Write a protein that binds this ligand. Structure first.
Ligand SMILES: *[C@@H]1O[C@H](CO)[C@@H](O[C@@H]2O[C@H](CO)[C@@H](O[C@@H]3O[C@H](CO)[C@@H](O)[C@H](O)[C@@H]3O)[C@H](O)[C@H]2NC(C)=O)[C@H](O)[C@H]1NC(C)=O
Ligand SMILES: *[C@@H]1O[C@H](CO)[C@@H](O[C@@H]2O[C@H](CO)[C@@H](O[C@@H]3O[C@H](CO)[C@@H](O)[C@H](O)[C@@H]3O)[C@H](O)[C@H]2NC(C)=O)[C@H](O)[C@H]1NC(C)=O
Ligand SMILES: *[C@@H]1O[C@H](CO)[C@@H](O[C@@H]2O[C@H](CO)[C@@H](O)[C@H](O)[C@H]2NC(C)=O)[C@H](O)[C@H]1NC(C)=O
Ligand SMILES: *[C@@H]1O[C@H](CO)[C@@H](O[C@@H]2O[C@H](CO)[C@@H](O)[C@H](O)[C@H]2NC(C)=O)[C@H](O)[C@H]1NC(C)=O
Ligand SMILES: O=c1ccn([C@@H]2O[C@H](CO)[C@@H](O)[C@H]2O)c(=O)[nH]1
Ligand SMILES: O=c1ccn([C@@H]2O[C@H](CO)[C@@H](O)[C@H]2O)c(=O)[nH]1
Ligand SMILES: *[C@@H]1O[C@H](CO)[C@@H](O)[C@H](O)[C@H]1NC(C)=O
Ligand SMILES: *[C@@H]1O[C@H](CO)[C@@H](O)[C@H](O)[C@H]1NC(C)=O
Ligand SMILES: *[C@@H]1O[C@H](CO)[C@@H](O)[C@H](O)[C@H]1NC(C)=O
Ligand SMILES: *[C@@H]1O[C@H](CO)[C@@H](O)[C@H](O)[C@H]1NC(C)=O
Ligand SMILES: *[C@@H]1O[C@H](CO)[C@@H](O)[C@H](O)[C@H]1NC(C)=O
Ligand SMILES: *[C@@H]1O[C@H](CO)[C@@H](O)[C@H](O)[C@H]1NC(C)=O
Ligand SMILES: *[C@@H]1O[C@H](CO)[C@@H](O)[C@H](O)[C@H]1NC(C)=O
Ligand SMILES: *[C@@H]1O[C@H](CO)[C@@H](O)[C@H](O)[C@H]1NC(C)=O
Ligand SMILES: *[C@@H]1O[C@H](CO)[C@@H](O)[C@H](O)[C@H]1NC(C)=O
Ligand SMILES: *[C@@H]1O[C@H](CO)[C@@H](O)[C@H](O)[C@H]1NC(C)=O
Ligand SMILES: *[C@@H]1O[C@H](CO)[C@@H](O)[C@H](O)[C@H]1NC(C)=O
Ligand SMILES: *[C@@H]1O[C@H](CO)[C@@H](O)[C@H](O)[C@H]1NC(C)=O
Ligand SMILES: *[C@@H]1O[C@H](CO)[C@@H](O)[C@H](O)[C@H]1NC(C)=O
Ligand SMILES: *[C@@H]1O[C@H](CO)[C@@H](O)[C@H](O)[C@H]1NC(C)=O
Lengths: 748, 748
């Protein structure tokens, strides 16, 4: 669109995406209309006053991860960009803060460099700075120096709201912090003592992160240095006195054995309290601090286990009943054998508690009926226990994953129960009695070997999304699951166990019984043989995932029984036939795929040939995905066979000719993917649709191009249609002639 | 060696391997010294009198699978090959038996063609034939005709010993069979009735296969047509009267409900009796026929279950106690809930019974102590049941797999117990009491989540090979397995369950405790973090499989703890580091790999660079395997860094230059693999070792070669060293110049 950069005029403003394009310099061709410039992930080793001459409306520049193999920045290189507000210089191996940065700046990131010198000369004049990131310059077993913070360097930054200094060796909270601060990150900074003076004047603070100071190092997944004797962090009883607005407090991995309730005396708006990786089993049981937390919404007490201990029960203070605003409680990694109804009484009147997380506790037994007696649990998270039948992203949390506990597609339906990664290897007749009205149920990876027979889920009959992936279900009864009459989504992925055995029964008849089944995933089941009924049928099903089965055997030329296997899926729009070892598809089998299809995937098979003519029988087909096969040839008469195709994905095949004509009157085609094929060239005509083109994406990288003078018309075409995104254009590489043998088009 | 063919002068005789070389004709360059010629798997569409002009010492020709896309053979094409004994013409889409075949023939195979016409004109003069294969010409839902066998066609073949007509539509045993027959195959031939006359004169017969006539079709994994009403095959009571020498009788899938004991009256040397896929639950219980089988060594009664039945116990006739020669009993697929000691009393005095196979019965409970009371069980096969804590190869068996029940590497150690693919999800304290002295134990795929602690295998303390693959073991105790003091082979593959979780313990210390541990497989465990001890140690271990773990994280530049992870494996010769997502290996980590290594695999990683200089620290290194990485460059000074390397595998990398010099003084190098790289050319010098070369294999296929006149010296070199196998030479393909763009070298 603006080589070597794209642009988006989106919408008030103008972004030049010049990312990951192995540039060796800032390109001088950037349009002076651009406001934001992304130069990240290139090979840039120098920035000078020449670099942005040039581009006086620039308000943001992202130089992260250059050269991605440090970056050498001249004094005052940016100094004449009057409008520059945001400057990202992460992971550039910088040995110092660049000198002569512009006073315009409001955001500066210097995360993941080699800076151990924070000087007034560097930053004290940047008086418009709001956010300053200096995290991850010295940590673990990196070779590096303690951070030298010149006294009062930050004091003149009277607009500073965010300061991040985590993952650096500091030893003390810096003094003379501006009272504008709202968020102060000091994790893993080797700070053993927090004095009364350290945060005294910071009355605007809403976040304080002191995690990983005096860390808990047992079983640490990184190089970990504890305080002497694995001692607790030492926090003066008044250290938080003035922090009246505090909303987030992270004390994870500070080796706490005791929580000074007084810490929260003046902090009545605290909403999120993170106490993972301490030694708090005692405090969880007794727990004065728990009376001081009236507005607390999220409490994380995960991984406080005593090593080698495996108590029968979890011991929860009555004082949990004081957590009236609590929405989510995380108690992973306490480690205990049995959860009884009594043990959680202090939680049962908390009006807003919607999520309980007891993952990873090695729990053997649960009194399931206790959950009903909560006021309004929405998410009951029991994944990764022992229940049986009745390297680091600097912009992420370091102590826990932040992905939803339950997939949003499943939780959307209603109350959720996650029993994955346990040992519920069959479901007895009372397994789900006394539960709430579960809508979303996860029994993935229970090595369940049951003959489901239409009774097993009768006590939670309203499940709508059921995840049964990674079990070993035995399909010997045609009434399986049929008691779930409102079932919409059924994941049977990775249940190959019994499908792989010819000699036992495989009954999938049950599929047809559901009036509202929409999405079925039969992936990675190794299905090659069925009992009695060879046809799948449903008046409702939208999407069928059949990848990683054996259609190569089901559609074997000497066997006619499966030739209409999917035809009875009369509503189907989406079908995934990937990874079925197919070398060809019998024409009759293809013509019996449902005519309702809008999306068909046959990627990662071994197809030599595709019968294009048969697309005439699929007038609703919008996406066809044939990536990763062995195809040599495309039809020259595509518009004779489809008027509907919008996306055609043909990467990783053996296509050496692209017929002039291919284009013709195709019109619906938005997205054509020809990357990773055997293409020496591309003719003009092969694109120039004499109707209207919807062409907006055309992929070509990984073809052995030839950059003889003509050209082709291709380059001319490219400019004739600057609005056709062609990603990875730098990866479209002349393999010839030899004056180009590793060059990107174009350059003459 | 003899383009386009190899040759082996091995040893009295001379084999020309011209297989799978996409030939379009029989090459006229075959040396008249050749005795056996393999032309299988090519694109040959014609055979004429010209084809073997030429080659008068030919005794064997294999033309199977031509053209592999039928084959058109002229009358008498082979007629002048006086010494021709064996002719394989399988899978050639032949519409008839070729005419004018030579009388010299002793073996003729015509399996998998379109022959429905067996005529005197075709074969009656082939009076030297011993073995005649005509199987698989008409079967399943192939479009084909009933087989017309001209009356008395076989009668003149008075040397015929083997006749195979299986998988053809016959309806009746052919009459006028020669009394020379020893083996008669008639499986799946649509023969409903066996009369007294059918085998009357066949006194030399030792094998008769009548399987799949009136088949059991429930749950059939192929198109199956039963006799009317699913009726039994009808075998006249005297049909086997004269078959006194019979050794093998296959009656699998003949819908038998009743076994006429009289069938075996005159057949006292029967050794193998196959009765799979019938309806014999009644006969197994009552069983007169069982008294008639004194020399029987293998009995197969698998898959006789009654559909939908799930009896509590298996019912075995007392008459099994008459099977005095029995060595192996196969009772898969009976389907029953519990095996009690009583139920197998009739087996317990059989002196030679070494294998009991009860796979695939969905058994829930076993009285394990019953096995001890057998005389000398060697293999106790219980795989694929429900036990819980206390398309078709025409040359293979069609009704069961013929691979060993136990891997020979494990069974070699002694008595074997296979409990794989059950639900023994923990091992209680008495689980293995009252067993024989087990040496080989398979607990693979029991979803076992146990903390092994050094007591669990105490009642079978002599296990030497333990297969624990595909479980979810929790390594929380450093004494795991240590009670097995003689343990030699330990397979922990596919136990990623708990390794993937950072926050729980992973203790592999136990490895060091074993005095005789030789082979350890830790593949596909996703190992990225260990507890307390970061080093693996053993004075004995020979082989460590560490593929599919996360060495990319273990050897992260900011973490020093795993930099000597394998160093303490002081005896190690073989190490597999494949599939660990490695982009580079820190030099220190490489130099700390044990100096004892003779074989190192680092294939299927993402390496851009390899430090060749560090091979100086591995003076015993014989094999180095770097396939499937991103390497661009080879060292020009290999002999400076190793004098030991014998095999170097470098396929699927990005190597475009092969330094002249690479060769130099390398001498130990037998096998060089450069296939699937980016090589435009290969210089002469790059090979011509001025010391002695051990070069015997050099792979090059899948490189973009250039076939400009010079040449190189390469082609000259090739002939200068005709004894260097270069497999897939036809796949070494000129990508240039354009007069060659898809040609194989060489051709000018
Ligand atoms: C078995 O198949 C189902 C159906 O394909 C899989 O769930 C589906 O996963 C896709 C791929 O992630 C989800 O699509 C994504 O949704 C997000 C959020 O809306 C969107 O941002 C992405 O661009 C993408 O569209 C799809 O919603 C989801 N469907 C359902 C019903 O949950 C499932 O993951 C497969 N199971 C396994 C074990 O592979
Ligand atoms: C875990 O690793 C072990 C050790 O590599 C695997 O067993 C080993 O498998 C190899 C590959 O098949 C066996 O080598 C083969 O032996 C046969 C018969 O002697 C030979 O003909 C072949 O050319 C080849 O050498 C090797 O014997 C065997 N080792 C042992 C101790 O059994 C094992 O399969 C791996 N487990 C999984 C689940 O992948
Ligand atoms: C059911 O639980 C399983 C296991 O906890 C979930 O599987 C994980 O899904 C996440 C998010 O997609 C993946 O990144 C993980 O790799 C999966 N983990 C494993 C162990 O397979 C699954 O998503 C849960 N189902 C629902 C509906 O929430
Ligand atoms: C333990 O049992 C497992 C399962 O029966 C065996 O695994 C099979 O091994 C065969 C022969 O290598 C493979 O072709 C199969 O794919 C494997 N099956 C499965 C389900 O994984 C294993 O070989 C047995 N171990 C020993 C020592 O005999
Ligand atoms: O089955 C169990 C039970 C308890 N623990 C404990 O859980 C903690 C984390 O692994 C350790 O202290 C360990 O003793 C386990 O690891 N596995
Ligand atoms: O768990 C069980 C028990 C029995 N069967 C029976 O085994 C035979 C083969 O699948 C069928 O008759 C079926 O009823 C099973 O499939 N699963
Ligand atoms: C950059 O600075 C040099 C002097 O060091 C000057 O000669 C040159 O014109 C400057 N370039 C721009 C674009 O200002
Ligand atoms: C940085 O670059 C300048 C010129 O662009 C050069 O003179 C200087 O040596 C470089 N500094 C470092 C520390 O590499
Ligand atoms: C710190 O930076 C200052 C100010 O730019 C510089 O003068 C000094 O040399 C630096 N000191 C160290 C130790 O890097
Ligand atoms: C607190 O914050 C605001 C800006 O959000 C600032 O203007 C005000 O002066 C601050 N007060 C103190 C005491 O720092
Ligand atoms: C399925 O199981 C139910 C419950 O045991 C049983 O009653 C029914 O007969 C079974 N078979 C079929 C085909 O539905
Ligand atoms: C058919 O599929 C569509 C999506 O294409 C879905 O909206 C509708 O609910 C399904 N129809 C039926 C009858 O279930
Ligand atoms: C495509 O299939 C049609 C109908 O099955 C058939 O007539 C035609 O020959 C096939 N085309 C190719 C190119 O094989
Ligand atoms: C093959 O037969 C033809 C006659 O059909 C004859 O002219 C020719 O010489 C023969 N070739 C050989 C090698 O015998
Ligand atoms: C077989 O080949 C001969 C000549 O080589 C040709 O004349 C004849 O038509 C072919 N026969 C068939 C059935 O294709
Ligand atoms: C069978 O082969 C004979 C002898 O070669 C031939 O004459 C006849 O045409 C063939 N009959 C059929 C039905 O193919
Ligand atoms: C049986 O077999 C031998 C060859 O093995 C043959 O010579 C002998 O004549 C045969 N006897 C009969 C009765 O066919
Ligand atoms: C391992 O388990 C055994 C048996 O319970 C126990 O006695 C021992 O103390 C455990 N721990 C270690 C480190 O061996
Ligand atoms: C060391 O390895 C070899 C194979 O290299 C093996 O023969 C020997 O038993 C092992 N040594 C010890 C001490 O276990
Ligand atoms: C190979 O490693 C050695 C020793 O660690 C080091 O001196 C040398 O620079 C490395 N070689 C390359 C080519 O990086």
């Amino acid at each position: 669109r603006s080589y070597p950069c794209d642009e988006k005029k989106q919408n008030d403003s103008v972004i030049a995406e010049c990312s990951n394009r192995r540039l060796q310099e800032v390109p001088q061709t950037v349009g002076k209309y651009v406001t934001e410039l992304d130069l990240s992930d290139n090979f840039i080793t120098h920035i000078t006053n020449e670099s942005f001459q040039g581009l006086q409306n620039l308000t943001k520049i992202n130089l992260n991860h250059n050269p991605n193999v440090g970056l050498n920045i001249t004094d005052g290189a940016f100094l004449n960009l009057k409008n520059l507000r945001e400057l990202l210089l992460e992971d550039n191996q910088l040995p110092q803060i660049p000198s002569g940065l512009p006073e315009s700046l409001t955001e500066l990131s210097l995360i993941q460099n080699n800076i151990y010198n924070i000087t007034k000369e560097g930053i004290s004049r940047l008086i418009n700075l709001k956010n300053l990131y200096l995290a991850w310059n010295c940590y673990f077993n990196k070779v590096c120096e303690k951070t030298n913070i010149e006294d009062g360097v930050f004091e003149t930054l009277t607009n500073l709201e965010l300061l991040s200094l985590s993952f650096n060796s500091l030893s003390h909270v810096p003094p003379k912090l501006p009272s504008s601060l709202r968020k102060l990150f000091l994790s893993n900074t080797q700070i053993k003592y927090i004095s009364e003076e350290d945060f005294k004047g910071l009355i605007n603070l809403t976040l304080l992160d002191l995690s990983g100071n005096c860390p808990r190092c047992f079983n640490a997944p990184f190089p970990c240095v504890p305080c002497d004797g694995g001692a607790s962090i030492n926090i003066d009883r008044f250290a938080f006195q003035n922090l009246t607005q505090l909303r987030y407090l992270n004390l994870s991995s500070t080796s706490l054995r005791k929580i000074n309730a007084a810490w929260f005396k003046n902090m009545p708006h605290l909403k999120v309290l993170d106490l993972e990786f301490n030694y708090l089993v005692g405090e969880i049981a007794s727990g004065a601090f728990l009376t001081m937390l009236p507005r607390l919404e999220i409490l994380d007490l995960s991984f406080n286990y005593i090593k080698g201990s495996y108590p029968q029960h979890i011991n929860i203070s009555r004082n949990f009943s004081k957590l009236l605003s609590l929405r989510a409680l995380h108690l992973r990694g306490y480690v205990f054998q049995e959860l009884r109804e009594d043990d959680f009484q202090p939680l049962m009147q908390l009006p807003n508690l919607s999520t309980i997380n007891l993952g990873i506790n090695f729990i053997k037994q649960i009194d399931f009926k206790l959950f009903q007696n909560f006021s309004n649990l929405e998410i009951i998270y029991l994944s990764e226990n022992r229940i049986s039948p009745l390297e680091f992203d600097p912009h992420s949390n370091f102590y826990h994953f932040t992905r939803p506990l339950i997939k949003p597609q499943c939780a959307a339906y209603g109350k959720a129960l996650d029993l994955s990664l346990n040992s519920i290897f069959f479901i007895g007749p009372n397994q789900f009695e006394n539960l709430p009205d579960i809508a979303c149920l996860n029994l993935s990876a229970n090595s369940n070997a049951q003959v489901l027979s239409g009774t097993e889920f009768s006590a939670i009959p309203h499940v709508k999304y059921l995840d049964l992936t990674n079990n070993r279900l035995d399909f010997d009864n045609a009434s399986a699951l049929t008691e779930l009459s409102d079932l919409e989504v059924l994941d049977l992925s990775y249940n190959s166990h019994y499908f792989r055995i010819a000699g036992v029964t495989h009954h999938l008849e049950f599929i047809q019984n559901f009036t509202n089944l929409k999405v079925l995933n039969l992936s990675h089941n190794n299905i090659y043989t069925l009992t009695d009924k060879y046809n799948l049928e449903s008046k409702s099903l939208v999407e069928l995932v059949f990848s990683g089965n054996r259609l190569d055997i089901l559609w074997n030329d000497d066997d006619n029984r499966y030739i209409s296997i999917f035809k009875g899926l009369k509503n189907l729009t989406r079908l995934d036939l990937s990874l079925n070892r197919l070398k060809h598809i019998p024409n009759e089998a293809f013509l019996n795929l449902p005519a309702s299809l809008t999306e068909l995937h046959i990627n990662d098979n071994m197809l030599k040939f595709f019968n294009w003519t048969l697309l005439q029988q699929f007038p609703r087909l919008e996406l066809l995905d044939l990536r990763g096969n062995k195809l040599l040839f495309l039809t020259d008469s595509l518009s004779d066979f489809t008027s509907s195709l919008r996306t055609l994905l043909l990467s990783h095949n053996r296509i050496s000719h692209l017929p002039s004509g291919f284009l013709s009157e195709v019109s619906s085609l938005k997205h054509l993917d020809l990357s990773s094929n055997l293409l020496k060239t591309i003719n003009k005509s092969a694109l120039e649709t004499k109707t209207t083109t919807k062409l907006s994406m055309l992929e070509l990288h990984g073809n052995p191009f030839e950059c003889t003078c003509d050209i082709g018309d291709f380059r001319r075409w490219m400019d004739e249609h600057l609005n056709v995104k062609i990603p990875r254009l730098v990866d479209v590489i002349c393999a010839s002639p030899g004056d180009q043998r590793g060059k990107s088009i174009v350059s003459l």
